[PDB]
């Protein structure tokens with residue numbers, strides 16, 4: 001047990017919930033884990049795997065990201081800030097990828113899932129890139145039920161950090177695709193209160209947030225600190241009661257503990 005793990009434990013204790021953290025520091029490839037091998041509901045953090053799977057498909061179909069997808073009124077789910085504007089028209093797979101990643105659009109995610117042949121298509125991509133832990137079982141919005149003990153739509157912090165590293169800094173995607181994914185993550189609109197709130201402001205980052213039932217509050221980030229090699233950081237948090245409030249501040253605190261421990 002490390003000092004950083006003990007600080008994370010104190011944060012978790014005060015928070016009332018269950019916290020999962022995985023850091024990879026690419027300076028030396030060392031890792032800090034807190035409940036690194038426990039499962040958590042991914043919620044919208046799963047959008048990174050779906051967008052990446054479509055990017056992979058685009059490696060052998062140069063024009064795939066320009067392919068139109070019909071958006072019908074019946075397609076709209078519970079959170080559709082971009083898709084609602086395009087109902088009775090179309091959006092391209094690039095537009096859907098951007099909407100999913102940068103705005104957390106749930107209708108956009110469902111279109112990415114459909115393009116992959118269903119939730120199992122996303123899981124299959126995960127396996128193809130060496131992630132044996134990730135599982136996507138349902139579409140939006142039910143993938144966010146976040147029931148304690150339920151393995152559906154979960155991963156571990158350790159697995160997600162490894163995967164995010166391979167996707168954004170490694171060779172899981174072609175160079176063009178990797179750059180596109182990073183560009184999208186760095187353009188996220190939803191992340192200023194989560195991991196990135198706990199980081200020195202001179203640092204740059206991209207991230208994908210998620211939230212769901214049981215006060216589930218998540219963020220996964222790739223981070224470029226000032227004067228050192230990139231980090232990958234996953235912070236997952238979930239609470240015992242179905243209607244618990246979101247706690248982005250807990251993710252910020254976790255990130256701050258990690259940052260000061262470097």
Ligand SMILES: O=C1C=C(Nc2nnn[nH]2)CCC1
Pocket residue numbers: 044078079104190209210211212
């Ligand atoms: O509060 C909400 C959050 C949503 N998604 C989300 N939370 N963090 N990132 N994306 C969608 C439903 C309404």
